[model samples]
Target chain A: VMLNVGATAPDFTLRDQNQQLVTLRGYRGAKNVLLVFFPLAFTGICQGELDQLRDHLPEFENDDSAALAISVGPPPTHKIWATQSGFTFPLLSDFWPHGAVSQAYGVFNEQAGIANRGTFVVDRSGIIRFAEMKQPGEVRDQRLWTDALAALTA
Target chain B: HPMVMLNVGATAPDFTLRDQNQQLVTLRGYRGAKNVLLVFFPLAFTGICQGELDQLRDHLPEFENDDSAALAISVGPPPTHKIWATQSGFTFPLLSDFWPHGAVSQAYGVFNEQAGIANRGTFVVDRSGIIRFAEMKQPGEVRDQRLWTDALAALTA
Candidate 1:
């Protein structure tokens, strides 16, 4: 049940690494939300991807957008890892709820109990401007996201 | 193939976060260096990242010989990157694309949002801020930095 490019994004509420509850709907009036999903923390492909994000948070922030990354790791672990990694952003833990949001996005790898690499750029109206996913070990091009973001402002 | 191009000539997106010293760093402030090597990966404490960075670290002489700079990007935060750098002896800057979570990854066309990680995508920029070279590899495949090095070589300004 993979999502398509133009579907409305499903809203979700999850806790960040700080234990603060964050919701996708909170950004409705303020800005677009870039919803990113990854399998787990402390992995190779994942780290390389995030280091670029950390290196360029302003790209999305400057685009008048906010981003939320979701994973199934526990909050405690998320806290330690996020802090250690200098991840100033909130990393939400879907682990406690057990990959619920992932399933909603149709990204849960049921047999593996892990999420696939899924990304959705939700516009201010909560409509999905972009939706993409990759099989295990498949990586996406960042251009897909910027293209969608450009369309929002264009 | 759609030719998979994003943010090639656009303004390199901006992000602000604390470095290992907990000092604020942003993308828009790279000292006017001609290019930025935007590299993505899966995580910390992994073999691939260490291998790749180790090569980059050891080969700084080679990079300097080419008048280029490099940075390692990942989903992990600064502290995690710091620890890994210290342990792995990675002297170069290993950035954390933590907050705004994978936004930078998205900007570079290499983010795997659902996996909560980034696939391997390396972008080399010219002084004019255009991505002159962009390469993305499958998740487990070892990226040949030579391609990136060659890209950098093509622009020895």
Candidate 2:
């Protein structure tokens, strides 16, 4: 299990869909991060869930916070899926070591070869303020995330 | 490196995998019916791979008319394949060789153990389930589509 709230979010550097390096620490002082770990791309449930996230960007992002979705799909798949899904947020690939970042977050499913849905809200100071992991097939309720984000600024 | 290089006249190994739509697919399912064009690609959404698939998409009618079904397999999971297929507008089945991570590619002797990916392998299996032609290319290599058509054309010749 990964460290919970009050613990520092584990720092990671991964390549985004564009293959650009994205470091967790880079957002530390700039913006809060809604770190998301999705199981796979193009699955119906995953698509519907992420589409909500993408559609509700204003609710998730502000001057203080940004969102990033991580998955085990290779960089190329990330690139294409992001475009296909019209996702503006970065979809990081934890692919080379095969889910190293997902494993660091304690969400990787070794037996199933993918990550369960792990969501975390890391504040600007790099402290984890809220963390939740959904079991397989369970979709996230964006309202819960919005409430958490409101609390972060409140 | 890939463990083995499949040879002509050998019986293509049979395995079950999920296609882009999560449908269970078996190699033998096409036997004694349509000739199978088993294309093992390295990854999904790569530029060269996409280009090659696009070319296949453009000329797909030729393969179909030749009584061949093009099945492209990759190490990506079904979901990834699903998205790629949608974005590429591909009508063919994009099979996922995931889970055991390239198990089907390994069975076909095209799994790159060092890279944990499938090499660019193109195989044509006759209706009787025999391997008619097998060719393996290094990663990032694209097979000429004309050669595929020529091979397919010879299947019933």
Candidate 3:
């Protein structure tokens, strides 16, 4: 099941690829947040999606929204992937509680022990304006997210 | 973050890995029922590793009492753990930290960077899921079995 559009996005503190702590509340007033939840690092779909975001970062930047990608792997794993691929966004690790933040967003896969490809756009007021979860192993069309994000700002 | 890595009172890093029985075992499963004893060893068939496993195997009944459960993890695959458990007659969960290659071991800060294996690390996580006792043995250091018993003894009721 996916989180509903009007629900308040959950707050979490997770370490990024650089081992720096990032909070959902950190961008509340300054910027809207696009929470991107991927299953694992070093994979084709995840790499494509992250690289697409990196390549099209200006689409998000123009809207004043930060895309925070998350996964269940530890920070070291994220650090390696981020460095190898040159992804500048924060690759948040949900490892300690073992996907606690993923579970909060209703995107975690209990059996697989990772998150599904879930996407959400939370506005400056912390209310979710868009939410979606693709089937396991399915590659999502990132344009839907950009359209949703553009609509949110409009 | 406490000065010590995986310091006492820290939330134990949870994991879901295959056991010797080839069944999935999640650390969170022991959250409310039994205190968890997380033992990290380097390999399965080595002499020192076997010695440590036997000590706990012989004392399984007491060590894995109604109040606690012992789970030992290694980089060995699940079938390897299965045969090792069968040959050794050990009853506790021998989890495979393979596949991902020492991810859980690294999460506990017991991973040896050079060897690509885990050092000897033991953590006693109480029912509430807080680490009550944490110990990591270095090269040439022998763990006193009494320390484990004593830590298990002092677990909060």
- The docking category that best describes candidate 1 is incorrect
Q: Tell me the lDDT of model 1 at B156.
A: 76
In order, how many clashes per candidate? 63, 0, 0
DockQ of each: 0.03, 0.53, 0.02
- The whole-model lDDT of each prediction reads 0.72, 0.85, 0.81
Alpha carbon deviation, residue A105, candidate 2 (Å):
1.9
Candidate 2: which stretches are off by over 4 Å?
Answer: A1-3, A6-8, A56-63, A124-127, A136-138, A146-154, B1-4, B9-11, B32-34, B65-67, B112-116, B127-130
- DockQ: which is higher, 2 or 3? 2
CAPRI verdict (incorrect, acceptable, medium, high) for model 3: incorrect
lDDT of 1 by residue, B1-157 (tens): 1224454565555656555445676656653664567677776666676688777887776564445767678766666677667767777667766654566777766776456676878777776666777778766788887887788788776
Q: How close is candidate 3 to the true structure, as a TM-score?
A: 0.56
The worst-scoring run of ten residues by lDDT in candidate 3 chain A lies at A72-81
- Candidate 3, A1-154: lDDT as tens digits: 6789999999999888777999999888877888999987766788888999988887776647788999876665676567778888889978656678999999988876678999999998899999988875677877987888787666
- i-RMSD values for every candidate model: 9.8, 1.9, 10.6
RMSD of each: 17.6, 3.3, 12.2
CAPRI classification of candidate 2: medium
Model 3 clashing residue pairs (backbone) = none
Which stretches in model 3 have alpha-carbon errors above 4 Å?
A: B1-135, B138-157
